[PDB]
From a paper:
One enzyme, [name] (TIM; EC 5.3.1.1), is of particular interest as an anthelmintic target. TIM catalyzes the isomerization of glyceraldehyde-3-phosphate and dihydroxyacetone phosphate in the fifth step of the glycolytic pathway. Structurally, most of the known TIMs are homodimers, each monomer consisting of eight parallel β-strands surrounded by eight α-helices that, together, form a typical “TIM barrel” fold.
To elucidate the molecular basis of FhTIM inhibition, we obtained the crystal structure of FhTIM at 1.9 Å resolution. The asymmetric unit displays three FhTIM dimers. Each protomer shows a typical (β/α)8 TIM-barrel fold. The catalytic pocket of each protomer in the FhTIM structure is occupied by a sulfate molecule (SO42−), likely from the crystallization buffer. The β/α loop 6 (residues 168–180 of FhTIM) is known to open and close when accommodating the substrate in triosephosphate isomerases. Here, the loops are in the close conformation in all of the protomers of FhTIM. Interestingly, the SO42− ion is located in the same position as the phosphate group of the substrates (glyceraldehyde 3 P) in the P. falciparum (Pf TIM) or S. aureus TIM structures (PDB ID: 1LYX15 and 3UWU24, respectively) through similar interactions. Indeed, the three unbound oxygen atoms of the O4 tetrahedron in the triose phosphate moiety of Pf TIM interact with the main chain nitrogen of residues G175, S211, G236 and G237, as do 3 out of 4 oxygen atoms of the FhTIM SO42−. The remaining oxygen of the SO42− present in the FhTIM structure (and spatially corresponding to the oxygen atom linking the phosphate to the sugar in the natural substrate) is coordinated by a water molecule roughly located at the position of the distal carbon of the substrate analog in Pf TIM. Attempts to understand the mechanism of interaction between the inhibitors and TIM via crystallization did not yield ligand-bound structures.
Residue numbers in the entry:
A (entry chain A), B (entry chain D): 2 to 251
C-alpha cells in the first residue's frame, strides 16, 4: 500500500446555468461525507465564486483554466489571483481541449503551472495521446514530452505535493471508449516510473495519477482497483447524479 | 449630421478584484456621465454576474470573449448562453490580445460573431494592425481581411444594429502611442467606405466605429471631434477615475 489518498475530479467543462448548478450542487451536498476521497468540481469562471459559496469546504472548487500572471493586458484571461479572490484554490491546466482545439503549447502550460504554484494554488495538469497518435504507437512519446514540460514548470521540489496529474487519452474523451483497466494501468505505471527516473522516487511514490476518459458509474470500480490509478477526472458524468457513485469507486 | 449615438466602452482586461471592483463602480455609479453616451464595461468572467448585479441598467456589462457553441466539452470556455444567464448582453470579440497572443483566427472570430448574434447578444468586434503591418503599408489589407471575416459571420443584414466596431491599432495598445486624430479619422473613414460598398449604405451610416489604444482624459476630445470616430474602447484608463471624463469626450 502507498500513502496516496483517492482523488475524484468532476470537470463540468462548458455546461451550467444558475438553475442547473443549484440542483447539481444540492445532490453533491446531499451525499454523506467521505473522509477517504478528495472531491473536486471544476466549474465555469462565471459560476466559480457562486459554486464555492454553495458547497461546504469539504469539496475543492477549481477553475477550468487560468493565465500566467496576476494582472495585465490579457483580454478574456483569468489569473490565480482572481481565482483565490473567488474563494478557490484549484485550477485544471493543459486539458486536452486547451492543448488541441485552443492550441496551448506544452511550454505555456509549464508557465501556467509555475505561476499557479507560486501563487499558492493546487494544480491538475492533464496529459495524454490522441487517437491518431495511439494508432501510430506514439502513446509513450506523447506522455513523456508532456510530463517533461510539466516538471520544467514546477517552482520547487516540495510543490509536487500540490499537483495531481490526470492521464486522459483523447480518444476516450466524449467517445464512450473508456480505456480498459489494463490500458490505463499500463500508462499510469509508465508515468509513475517516469517520475521515479526524471523526478524522484519520493515524488513518484506520493503523486496521485488519475485517469480521465469516459468514466462512468459502470466502469469506475474496476479502474480504481488498479494499483497505479489514484482517482479520476470525470467529464460528462460529473453533471449527473451518478457522479456520487463514481466518488465512491474505491 | 449622422444618426449615430456616442459609444464608450471600458475594457478592464485581466484586472479586477472584488475590492477594487467596488471602488471603480462607485466612481462610475456616483458620477453621472452624459445620458447621450452608451457606456459599456467589459469585465473578467469571474466577476461578470456581480458587476451586472451592482451597476445601473444605464450601463452595459460585457464579457471579454466567448465561444461559438451554446454548451459543450470546451474546458475553459464561456458561451453566450452563460453570459445571458449572468444577466449580461454584450461581448467583446476578436480583441488584439485574443488574435495575436491566444491564436484566434479571423474564421473563428467570424463564427463567434455568428453564434453571439444568433443568441441575441450585442457584440464589439475588434480590428486593427500591429506596428509592423503599419510600417509595411498594409493597414488597409489587414483591416479589410478582418472586416470580411466579420461580415461572413453576420447571420443577416438586420443584425448589424447589434454590432459596434472597435478599431484598435496594436501599436497604440498600452504604450502611450495614441493614433493622431487624423490617423484615426482616416482609418475609420476607409472602414466606413468598405462597409458602404460591401454591406449597405443603411449599415455604413448607422454603425459606430470606435477607437481604442492609449485613450485617456487628455486626448479623447480631439479624437472624438473627428466625424467617423464614434467613441472609444478604453483599456488602462478604464481602471482609473478619468474613465468618467472619457465618457464625457463628445
Amino acid at each position: 500500500a502507498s500513502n496516496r489518498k483517492f482523488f475524484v475530479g468532476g470537470n463540468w467543462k462548458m455546461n451550467g446555468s444558475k438553475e442547473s448548478n443549484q440542483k447539481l450542487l444540492k445532490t453533491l451536498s446531499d451525499a454523506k461525507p467521505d473522509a477517504n476521497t478528495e472531491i473536486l468540481v471544476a466549474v465555469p469562471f462565471v459560476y466559480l465564486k457562486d459554486v464555492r459559496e454553495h458547497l461546504d469546504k469539504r469539496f475543492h472548487v477549481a477553475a477550468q483554466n487560468c493565465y500566467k500572471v496576476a494582472s495585465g493586458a490579457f483580454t478574456g484571461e483569468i489569473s490565480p489571483a482572481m481565482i483565490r479572490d473567488c474563494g478557490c484554490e484549484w485550477v485544471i491546466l493543459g486539458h486536452s481541449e486547451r492543448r488541441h482545439i485552443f492550441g496551448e503549447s506544452d511550454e505555456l502550460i509549464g508557465e501556467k503551472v509555475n505561476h499557479a504554484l507560486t501563487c499558492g494554488l493546487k494544480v491538475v495538469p492533464c496529459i495524454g495521446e490522441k487517437l491518431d497518435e495511439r494508432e501510430a504507437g506514439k502513446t509513450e512519446q506523447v506522455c513523456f514530452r508532456q510530463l517533461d514540460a510539466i516538471k520544467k514548470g514546477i517552482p520547487k521540489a516540495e510543490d509536487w505535493s500540490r499537483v495531481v496529474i490526470a492521464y486522459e487519452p483523447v480518444w476516450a474523451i466524449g467517445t464512450g471508449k473508456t480505456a480498459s483497466p489494463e490500458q490505463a494501468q499500463e500508462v499510469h505505471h509508465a508515468v509513475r516510473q517516469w517520475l521515479e527516473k526524471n523526478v524522484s522516487q519520493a515524488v513518484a511514490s506520493s503523486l496521485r495519477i488519475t485517469y480521465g476518459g469516459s468514466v462512468t458509474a459502470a466502469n469506475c470500480k474496476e479502474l480504481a482497483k488498479k494499483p497505479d490509478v489514484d482517482g479520476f477526472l470525470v467529464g460528462g458524468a460529473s453533471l449527473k447524479p451518478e457522479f456520487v457513485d463514481i466518488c465512491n469507486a474505491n
